[PDB]
């Protein structure tokens, strides 16, 4: 089989350091006491360099063959806008990029921008910018002239996969659609990314290519909230229309941003499953003071059919953070293999559609496991009551506003 890695939401905090006063352990805790801080982080902190390095070192030494890597954004830490600048955002993205290029000199990597990959965060523009030009320079080892040109103009590109003839990655800037982006209010096609996307998918159709979509913020609804799409509804609906129309050319969709392990299945209006969607959890374990749950750090690997690119499996790895901070050594380890955790043949939409139908049945053992894996096994005693379960299952199965509302009405 072929394989590729997916990492996301690294969120390096360069200030992390163990010290007696736990309000000074990390600037990303914003003056709150780090809860139980160790060398690999704290649930109230973003990622120490040591954690990010241990993730990439695990990947390097895993014994897993992989022909490329996708990397879907958010490298600066969660600190207030005035504590960052354009220069600091670039410096952190540069550090992450150079860590990857130093450790994996021969591995093509396909990055996407996250909402924090800009100063101020979330305000990614629809014209060229310092950050777009800087990441064009940084990612030039992996990208050709046309990809570099679109990246500098609007933060998006497509690129052939050198090691996989007939495969093309489309890296969208979905931060252009993200609610907090005040640079794009009421634009029908910001940075002309929809037109471009349609043009690109058309060319892949006629060049007999398969396409993997990557982006930071995903399509669909947030599974912990009621009727809250991850990007603005207008843009979610327009993007999903493109994806449905081209669902025979797109062989997978891969997102980050939510810092959780989630599945979605894009269907049409009449319940026919069309395309599979995978949201990967973060390397950072950070959470706010009030939140009950967070994720363990995660990285994941996809297996696909050579020369075909049908998705065959997904292996999710994780770092048990409490364990690693208690002994001072990481033990990145397999959390689950999707086919064998869920007893499904593969990652095709039919397989995942049937699995979600299983999730919806009462006391489903599969949904209980899924919900535990949602937080990357942070809390094995975590409960999802009927309202919580309806929100998760409806967001998994229904990406568009109409079918999602239908789903909630019936549940
Ligand atoms: C991650 O590691 C921690 C630490 O070993 C595990 O938590 C321990 O679980 C045992 C068994 O229930 C408890 O008796 C200990 O009190 C726990 N230790 C701490 C420090 O909380 C945890 O179960 C591991 N996570 C997973 C998913 O296995
Ligand atoms: C942090 O913890 C110390 C030790 O308990 C305490 O004295 C201090 O007030 C705490 N500060 C905050 C902001 O919680
Ligand atoms: C990234 O930052 C860490 C600490 O902030 C430093 O130790 C490391 O050398 C940096 N890496 C690069 C490639 O600049
Ligand atoms: C799609 O691609 C073909 C082949 O390159 C081209 O002839 C055609 O004009 C394109 N159609 C659109 C709508 O862009
Ligand atoms: Zn993030
Ligand atoms: Zn984000």
Coordinates of C-alpha atoms and ligand atoms in Angstrom, one line a residue:
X1 CA 0.0 0.0 0.0
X2 CA 1.0 3.6 -0.2
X3 CA 1.1 5.8 2.9
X4 CA 1.2 9.5 3.9
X5 CA 1.4 11.4 7.2
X6 CA -1.0 14.1 8.4
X7 CA 0.1 16.5 11.1
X8 CA -1.7 19.7 12.2
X9 CA -2.1 22.4 14.8
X10 CA 1.5 22.2 16.1
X11 CA 1.1 25.6 18.0
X12 CA 4.7 26.0 19.2
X13 CA 5.0 28.1 22.3
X14 CA 8.7 29.2 22.4
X15 CA 8.3 30.4 26.0
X16 CA 7.5 27.1 27.5
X17 CA 9.9 26.1 30.3
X18 CA 9.5 24.3 33.6
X19 CA 9.8 26.7 36.5
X20 CA 8.5 27.0 40.1
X21 CA 5.9 29.7 39.4
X22 CA 3.4 27.9 37.2
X23 CA 1.9 31.1 35.9
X24 CA 5.3 31.7 34.2
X25 CA 5.7 28.2 32.6
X26 CA 4.1 29.3 29.3
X27 CA 2.8 32.5 27.8
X28 CA 0.0 30.6 26.2
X29 CA -1.6 29.9 29.6
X30 CA -2.1 33.7 29.8
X31 CA -1.3 34.0 33.5
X32 CA -3.2 30.9 34.7
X33 CA -1.3 28.3 36.6
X34 CA -0.1 25.5 34.4
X35 CA -2.1 22.6 35.8
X36 CA 0.5 19.9 36.0
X37 CA 3.4 20.9 33.7
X38 CA 6.0 18.6 32.4
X39 CA 8.7 18.5 29.7
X40 CA 6.1 17.5 27.0
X41 CA 3.6 20.3 27.9
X42 CA 0.5 21.0 30.0
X43 CA -3.2 21.0 29.2
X44 CA -3.2 24.8 29.8
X45 CA -0.2 25.4 27.5
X46 CA 0.5 25.1 23.9
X47 CA 3.3 22.8 22.6
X48 CA 6.9 22.9 23.9
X49 CA 9.5 22.5 21.2
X50 CA 10.3 19.2 22.9
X51 CA 6.8 17.8 22.2
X52 CA 6.7 18.9 18.5
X53 CA 10.2 17.5 18.0
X54 CA 9.2 14.2 19.7
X55 CA 6.3 13.9 17.3
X56 CA 8.4 14.4 14.2
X57 CA 11.2 12.1 15.6
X58 CA 8.6 9.4 16.2
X59 CA 7.5 9.7 12.6
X60 CA 11.1 9.6 11.4
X61 CA 11.9 6.5 13.3
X62 CA 8.5 4.7 13.1
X63 CA 9.5 2.2 10.5
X64 CA 6.5 3.3 8.5
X65 CA 7.0 4.0 4.8
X66 CA 5.4 7.2 3.7
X67 CA 5.7 9.0 0.3
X68 CA 4.6 12.4 1.5
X69 CA 3.2 14.4 4.3
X70 CA 0.3 16.9 4.6
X71 CA 0.5 19.6 7.3
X72 CA -2.7 21.7 7.8
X73 CA -1.7 24.8 9.6
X74 CA -1.6 26.7 12.9
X75 CA 1.9 27.0 14.0
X76 CA 2.0 30.1 16.3
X77 CA 0.7 29.7 19.9
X78 CA -2.5 30.9 21.5
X79 CA -1.4 34.3 22.9
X80 CA -3.1 37.7 22.6
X81 CA -2.6 39.5 19.3
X82 CA -0.4 42.3 20.8
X83 CA 2.1 39.6 22.1
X84 CA 2.8 38.6 18.5
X85 CA 3.7 40.4 15.2
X86 CA 4.1 39.6 11.6
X87 CA 7.8 38.9 12.1
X88 CA 7.2 36.5 15.0
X89 CA 4.4 34.6 13.2
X90 CA 6.9 34.2 10.3
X91 CA 9.7 33.2 12.6
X92 CA 7.6 30.4 14.2
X93 CA 6.3 29.1 10.8
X94 CA 10.0 29.2 9.6
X95 CA 11.0 27.1 12.6
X96 CA 8.3 24.5 12.0
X97 CA 9.1 24.4 8.3
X98 CA 12.9 24.0 8.9
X99 CA 12.3 21.3 11.5
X100 CA 10.5 19.3 8.9
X101 CA 13.0 20.0 6.1
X102 CA 15.9 19.2 8.4
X103 CA 14.4 15.9 9.5
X104 CA 12.8 14.8 6.2
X105 CA 15.0 16.3 3.5
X106 CA 13.6 14.0 0.7
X107 CA 9.9 14.1 1.7
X108 CA 7.4 16.3 -0.2
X109 CA 5.2 18.1 2.3
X110 CA 2.0 19.9 1.4
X111 CA 1.2 22.7 3.9
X112 CA -2.0 24.7 4.4
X113 CA -2.3 27.9 6.3
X114 CA -4.2 28.0 9.6
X115 CA -6.1 30.9 11.1
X116 CA -3.2 31.6 13.5
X117 CA -0.7 31.6 10.6
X118 CA -1.1 35.4 10.2
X119 CA -0.8 38.6 12.2
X120 CA -3.3 39.5 13.6
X121 CA -4.7 35.9 13.8
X122 CA -7.8 35.1 11.7
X123 CA -7.3 38.2 9.4
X124 CA -6.0 36.4 6.4
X125 CA -6.4 38.8 3.4
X126 CA -7.6 38.2 -0.2
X127 CA -4.5 39.8 -1.8
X128 CA -0.8 39.3 -1.5
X129 CA 0.8 39.8 1.9
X130 CA 4.1 39.5 3.8
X131 CA 3.0 36.2 5.3
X132 CA 1.8 34.8 2.0
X133 CA 5.2 35.7 0.3
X134 CA 7.2 34.4 3.2
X135 CA 5.5 31.0 3.2
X136 CA 5.8 30.9 -0.5
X137 CA 9.6 31.2 -0.1
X138 CA 9.6 28.7 2.8
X139 CA 7.6 26.0 1.0
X140 CA 9.2 26.5 -2.4
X141 CA 11.1 23.2 -2.1
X142 CA 7.7 21.4 -2.3
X143 CA 5.9 23.7 -4.8
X144 CA 6.1 24.6 -8.4
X145 CA 5.9 28.0 -10.1
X146 CA 2.1 28.1 -10.4
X147 CA 1.5 26.9 -6.9
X148 CA 3.9 29.5 -5.6
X149 CA 2.1 32.2 -7.6
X150 CA -1.4 31.3 -6.2
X151 CA 0.1 30.9 -2.7
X152 CA 1.5 34.4 -2.7
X153 CA -1.7 35.9 -4.0
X154 CA -4.3 34.2 -1.7
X155 CA -2.7 31.5 0.4
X156 CA -3.9 28.5 -1.6
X157 CA -2.4 26.2 -4.3
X158 CA -2.5 22.9 -6.0
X159 CA 0.5 20.7 -6.6
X160 CA 1.2 17.3 -8.1
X161 CA 2.6 14.6 -5.8
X162 CA 6.0 13.8 -7.2
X163 CA 6.1 10.2 -5.8
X164 CA 2.5 9.5 -6.8
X165 CA 1.8 10.1 -10.5
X166 CA -1.9 10.9 -11.1
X167 CA -2.3 12.4 -7.6
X168 CA -2.7 16.2 -7.0
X169 CA -3.2 17.9 -3.7
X170 CA -5.4 21.0 -3.5
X171 CA -4.5 23.1 -0.4
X172 CA -7.3 25.5 0.2
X173 CA -7.2 28.6 2.4
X174 CA -10.5 28.0 4.2
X175 CA -9.6 30.8 6.7
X176 CA -11.0 33.1 4.1
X177 CA -14.4 31.6 5.1
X178 CA -13.8 31.5 8.8
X179 CA -16.3 33.6 10.9
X180 CA -13.8 35.7 12.7
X181 CA -12.1 36.8 9.5
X182 CA -13.2 40.4 9.1
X183 CA -11.2 40.8 5.9
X184 CA -13.8 38.8 3.8
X185 CA -17.2 39.9 5.1
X186 CA -19.9 39.7 2.3
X187 CA -17.4 38.7 -0.5
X188 CA -19.1 36.1 -2.8
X189 CA -15.7 34.6 -3.9
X190 CA -12.8 35.8 -1.7
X191 CA -9.4 35.7 -3.5
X192 CA -11.3 34.0 -6.4
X193 CA -10.7 30.7 -4.7
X194 CA -14.0 29.1 -5.7
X195 CA -13.5 29.9 -9.4
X196 CA -9.9 28.7 -9.2
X197 CA -11.0 25.6 -7.3
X198 CA -13.5 24.8 -10.0
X199 CA -11.0 25.4 -12.7
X200 CA -8.5 23.2 -11.0
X201 CA -10.9 20.3 -10.5
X202 CA -11.9 20.6 -14.1
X203 CA -8.2 20.2 -15.2
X204 CA -7.8 17.2 -12.9
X205 CA -10.8 15.6 -14.5
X206 CA -9.4 16.0 -17.9
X207 CA -5.8 15.1 -16.9
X208 CA -7.1 11.9 -15.3
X209 CA -5.9 12.9 -11.9
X210 CA -7.2 12.0 -8.4
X211 CA -7.4 14.9 -5.9
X212 CA -6.9 15.1 -2.1
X213 CA -8.3 18.3 -0.6
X214 CA -6.4 19.7 2.4
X215 CA -7.3 22.8 4.4
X216 CA -7.2 24.0 8.0
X217 CA -10.8 24.9 8.9
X218 CA -13.1 22.0 7.8
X219 CA -16.4 22.1 6.0
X220 CA -19.6 20.9 7.9
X221 CA -20.9 21.6 11.4
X222 CA -19.0 21.6 14.7
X223 CA -20.1 18.4 16.4
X224 CA -20.2 19.7 20.0
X225 CA -22.5 22.7 19.2
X226 CA -26.0 23.2 17.8
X227 CA -26.2 24.5 14.2
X228 CA -22.7 26.1 14.2
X229 CA -20.8 25.5 10.9
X230 CA -17.0 25.6 11.1
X231 CA -16.9 28.2 8.3
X232 CA -19.7 30.7 7.6
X233 CA -22.9 28.9 6.2
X234 CA -22.8 30.8 2.8
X235 CA -19.3 29.6 2.2
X236 CA -19.9 26.1 3.6
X237 CA -22.8 25.6 1.2
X238 CA -20.8 26.9 -1.8
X239 CA -17.8 24.8 -1.1
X240 CA -19.9 21.7 -0.5
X241 CA -21.7 22.2 -3.8
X242 CA -18.3 22.2 -5.6
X243 CA -17.1 19.1 -3.6
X244 CA -20.4 17.1 -4.4
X245 CA -20.2 18.0 -8.1
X246 CA -16.6 16.7 -8.2
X247 CA -17.0 13.9 -5.7
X248 CA -15.8 11.4 -8.3
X249 CA -12.5 13.2 -8.8
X250 CA -11.8 13.9 -5.1
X251 CA -10.6 10.7 -3.3
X252 CA -10.3 12.3 0.2
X253 CA -10.6 15.4 2.3
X254 CA -8.3 16.2 5.2
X255 CA -8.7 19.0 7.8
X256 CA -7.4 20.3 11.1
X257 CA -8.4 23.3 13.3
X258 CA -10.8 21.5 15.7
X259 CA -8.0 19.7 17.6
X260 CA -10.2 16.6 17.6
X261 CA -10.5 13.3 15.9
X262 CA -13.7 13.5 13.8
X263 CA -15.2 11.8 10.8
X264 CA -17.6 13.3 8.3
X265 CA -19.3 11.8 5.3
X266 CA -20.3 14.2 2.5
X267 CA -23.7 13.1 1.0
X268 CA -26.1 14.6 -1.5
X269 CA -29.6 15.9 -0.7
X270 CA -31.1 12.4 -0.9
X271 CA -28.7 10.6 1.4
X272 CA -26.3 9.1 -1.2
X273 CA -22.8 9.0 0.4
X274 CA -20.3 10.8 -1.9
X275 CA -17.0 11.6 -0.3
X276 CA -15.0 10.9 2.9
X277 CA -13.8 13.6 5.3
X278 CA -11.1 13.2 8.0
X279 CA -10.5 15.9 10.7
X280 CA -7.2 15.1 12.5
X281 CA -6.4 16.0 16.1
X282 CA -3.8 18.5 17.2
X283 CA -0.2 18.0 18.4
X284 CA -0.9 20.8 21.0
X285 CA -3.0 19.7 24.1
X286 CA -4.0 23.2 25.0
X287 CA -7.3 24.1 26.5
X288 CA -8.8 27.1 28.3
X289 CA -9.4 27.3 32.0
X290 CA -13.0 26.4 32.0
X291 CA -13.1 23.6 29.5
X292 CA -13.6 20.1 30.9
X293 CA -11.8 18.0 28.2
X294 CA -8.9 18.4 25.8
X295 CA -7.0 16.1 23.4
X296 CA -3.9 14.1 23.8
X297 CA -1.3 15.0 21.2
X298 CA -1.8 13.1 17.9
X299 CA -0.3 12.4 14.5
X300 CA -1.9 10.1 11.9
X301 CA -1.1 8.0 8.8
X302 CA -3.2 7.2 5.8
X303 CA -2.9 4.1 3.7
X304 CA -4.1 4.2 0.0
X305 CA -4.1 2.0 -3.1
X306 CA -1.0 2.8 -5.2
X307 CA -1.7 4.4 -8.5
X308 CA -5.4 4.5 -7.5
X309 CA -5.5 6.6 -4.3
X310 CA -8.7 5.0 -2.8
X311 CA -8.3 5.4 0.9
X312 CA -7.7 2.0 2.5
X313 CA -7.0 2.7 6.2
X314 CA -6.0 5.3 8.8
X315 CA -3.7 4.7 11.8
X316 CA -4.0 7.2 14.6
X317 CA -1.0 7.6 16.9
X318 CA -1.0 9.6 20.1
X319 CA 1.1 10.6 23.1
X320 CA -0.4 10.0 26.5
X321 CA 0.6 13.3 27.9
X322 CA 0.2 12.5 31.6
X323 CA 2.3 9.3 31.2
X324 CA 5.1 11.2 29.3
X325 CA 5.3 14.0 31.8
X326 CA 5.3 11.7 34.7
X327 CA 8.4 9.8 33.5
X328 CA 10.0 12.5 31.3
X329 CA 10.2 10.3 28.2
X330 CA 7.8 10.2 25.3
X331 CA 6.1 7.0 24.2
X332 CA 4.3 7.9 21.0
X333 CA 2.2 4.9 20.3
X334 CA -0.7 3.5 18.2
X335 CA -4.1 4.6 19.4
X336 CA -6.1 2.7 16.8
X337 CA -6.3 1.4 13.2
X338 CA -9.6 2.6 11.8
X339 CA -10.7 -0.6 9.9
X340 CA -10.0 -2.8 12.9
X341 CA -11.4 -0.4 15.6
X342 CA -14.7 -0.1 13.6
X343 CA -14.6 -3.4 11.6
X344 CA -15.0 -1.6 8.2
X345 CA -13.4 -2.8 4.9
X346 CA -11.8 0.6 4.1
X347 CA -12.3 4.5 4.2
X348 CA -14.7 4.7 1.2
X349 CA -17.9 6.8 1.8
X350 CA -20.1 3.6 1.7
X351 CA -18.0 2.0 4.6
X352 CA -18.2 5.2 6.7
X353 CA -21.8 5.9 5.9
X354 CA -22.8 2.4 7.2
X355 CA -20.6 2.9 10.2
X356 CA -22.3 6.2 11.1
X357 CA -25.7 4.4 10.8
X358 CA -24.3 2.0 13.4
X359 CA -23.2 4.9 15.6
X360 CA -26.8 6.2 15.7
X361 CA -28.3 3.0 17.2
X362 CA -28.9 3.1 21.0
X363 CA -26.0 2.1 23.3
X364 CA -23.8 1.7 20.2
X365 CA -20.4 0.3 21.4
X366 CA -18.9 1.8 18.2
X367 CA -20.1 5.4 19.1
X368 CA -18.8 5.0 22.7
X369 CA -15.3 4.2 21.3
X370 CA -15.6 7.0 18.7
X371 CA -16.4 9.5 21.4
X372 CA -13.4 8.4 23.5
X373 CA -11.1 8.7 20.4
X374 CA -12.6 12.1 19.7
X375 CA -10.4 13.5 22.5
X376 CA -7.6 11.2 21.5
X377 CA -8.2 9.0 24.6
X378 CA -7.6 11.9 27.0
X379 CA -10.6 10.9 29.2
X380 CA -11.8 7.3 29.0
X381 CA -14.6 8.1 31.4
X382 CA -16.0 10.8 29.2
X383 CA -19.8 10.7 28.6
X384 CA -22.0 11.8 25.7
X385 CA -25.6 12.1 26.7
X386 CA -28.5 11.9 24.1
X387 CA -28.3 15.5 23.2
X388 CA -24.5 15.3 22.8
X389 CA -24.8 12.1 20.7
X390 CA -27.4 13.7 18.4
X391 CA -25.1 16.7 17.8
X392 CA -22.1 14.4 17.0
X393 CA -24.0 11.9 14.7
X394 CA -25.8 14.7 12.9
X395 CA -22.6 16.7 12.3
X396 CA -20.8 13.4 11.2
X397 CA -23.5 12.6 8.6
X398 CA -24.9 16.0 7.5
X399 CA -22.5 18.6 6.2
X400 CA -25.1 21.0 4.6
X401 CA -27.5 23.2 6.4
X402 CA -30.7 21.6 5.2
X403 CA -29.9 18.0 5.9
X404 CA -28.3 18.9 9.3
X405 CA -31.5 20.7 10.4
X406 CA -33.5 17.7 9.2
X407 CA -31.3 15.5 11.3
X408 CA -31.7 17.5 14.5
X409 CA -35.5 17.8 14.1
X410 CA -35.7 14.0 13.9
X411 CA -33.4 13.4 16.9
Ligands
LIG1 C1 -2.4 7.7 30.3 O1 -1.5 7.5 31.3 C2 -2.1 7.7 32.6 C3 -1.0 7.5 33.6 O2 -0.5 6.2 33.6 C4 -3.3 6.8 32.9 O3 -3.9 7.2 34.0 C5 -3.8 6.3 35.1 O4 -4.8 5.3 35.1 C6 -4.8 4.4 36.2 C7 -5.8 3.3 35.8 O5 -7.1 3.8 35.9 C8 -5.2 5.1 37.4 O6 -5.3 4.3 38.5 C9 -4.1 6.2 37.7 O7 -4.4 7.0 38.8 C10 -4.0 7.1 36.4 N1 -2.8 8.0 36.6 C11 -2.9 9.3 36.6 C12 -1.6 10.0 36.8 O8 -3.9 9.9 36.4 C13 -4.3 6.8 31.7 O9 -5.2 5.8 31.8 C14 -3.5 6.7 30.4 N2 -4.4 6.9 29.2 C15 -4.9 5.9 28.5 C16 -5.8 6.3 27.3 O10 -4.6 4.7 28.7
LIG2 C1 -0.9 29.6 41.3 O1 -0.6 28.6 42.3 C2 0.0 29.1 43.5 C3 0.2 27.8 44.4 O2 -1.0 27.3 44.8 C4 -0.9 30.1 44.2 O3 -0.3 30.6 45.3 C5 -1.2 31.2 43.2 O4 -2.1 32.2 43.7 C6 -1.8 30.6 41.9 N1 -2.1 31.7 40.9 C7 -3.2 31.6 40.1 C8 -3.3 32.8 39.2 O5 -3.9 30.7 40.1
LIG3 C1 13.1 26.2 16.8 O1 13.0 26.8 18.2 C2 13.6 26.0 19.2 C3 13.3 26.6 20.5 O2 12.5 27.8 20.5 C4 15.1 25.9 18.9 O3 15.7 25.1 19.9 C5 15.4 25.3 17.6 O4 16.7 25.3 17.3 C6 14.6 26.1 16.5 N1 14.8 25.4 15.2 C7 15.1 26.0 14.1 C8 15.2 25.1 12.8 O5 15.3 27.2 14.0
LIG4 C1 -12.1 21.9 -18.7 O1 -10.8 21.4 -19.2 C2 -10.8 21.2 -20.6 C3 -9.5 20.5 -21.0 O2 -8.4 21.2 -20.5 C4 -11.1 22.5 -21.3 O3 -11.1 22.3 -22.7 C5 -12.4 23.1 -20.9 O4 -12.6 24.4 -21.4 C6 -12.4 23.3 -19.3 N1 -13.8 23.7 -18.9 C7 -14.0 24.7 -18.0 C8 -15.4 25.0 -17.7 O5 -13.1 25.3 -17.5
LIG5 ZN1 -5.3 25.3 16.1
LIG6 ZN1 -7.3 27.0 13.9

